[PDB]
Amino acid sequence: LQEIRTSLYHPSTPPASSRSWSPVVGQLVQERVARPASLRPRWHKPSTVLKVLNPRTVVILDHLGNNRTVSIDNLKPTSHQ
DNA sequence: GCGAAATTCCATGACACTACCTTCCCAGGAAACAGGTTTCACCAGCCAGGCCTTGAATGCAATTGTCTTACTAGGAATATTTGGACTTCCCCACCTACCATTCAGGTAACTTGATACAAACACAGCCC
């Protein structure tokens, strides 16, 4: 049974598309506003990546003084650095 | 030909009707409250003696309950006559919804002010 468990199907990683982007420690990033009210900013003010944990999970330093460990499906690259 | 600069490219994401709802956090303070201690004074519990009120027994008087009759008025049916509630249609003024502006009130604070309560000695009213 221990050799049954180690022969299981592993999923496939999709090919990385052309307009991907990678976080850089020091790059300016903007989180998404949590529950965006009507006629309000979708995004907060810029923030600087403290630490990168994997290429999908990044610790940013929010305007509140917050070490809010967000995903990279949250963030956007800060335009025109 | 390299580099700098001017330009075209293309992958992508967000717009689609939106707020509540739940549970935990935070928070400051405060709300008293629930908890508890402390002490003094008072109100409640105790018991009995005297008297007054209630209960009962009663006799009787008129009050009340029943019976009977002549009758008055109530009700119903009528025609009609009359008095109106609501449906109808339309327009205007009034209430509202809104923002900006400002004023007033509530909280809050520091002070002030004034009255009520607590105490003491005496007075008056009513009762035994």
> What is the C-alpha separation between A13 and A22, in angstroms, rounded?
17
Decide: CB of A40 under 7 A of nucleic strand B.
no
* The CATH number of the domain covering residues in A17-78: 2.30.30.140
Q: How was this structure determined?
A: cryo-EM
Question: Which of A32, A73, A65, A67 minimizes the C-alpha distance to A49?
Answer: A67
A54 touches strand B (CB under 7 A): no
Strand B and A38 CB separated by under 7 Å = yes
Domain residue ranges in chain A: 17-78
Report the distance separating Cα A55 and Cα A8, nearest Å.
25
Number of H helices and E strands in chain A, helices first, is 1, 5
Token reading at A41: 């900013």
Q: Is the CB of A19 under 7 A from strand B?
A: yes
Residue A21: burial class (beta carbons within 10 Å; 0-12, 13-18, 19+)? exposed
Task: Return the structure tokens found at A29.
Answer: 């990033």
Beta-bridge partner residues of A15: none
Resolution of the coordinates, Å: 3.9
Q: Which bases of chain B come closer than 7 Å to a protein CB?
A: 10-12, 14-15, 18-19
Written as six digits, the tokens of A76 are 């956007």
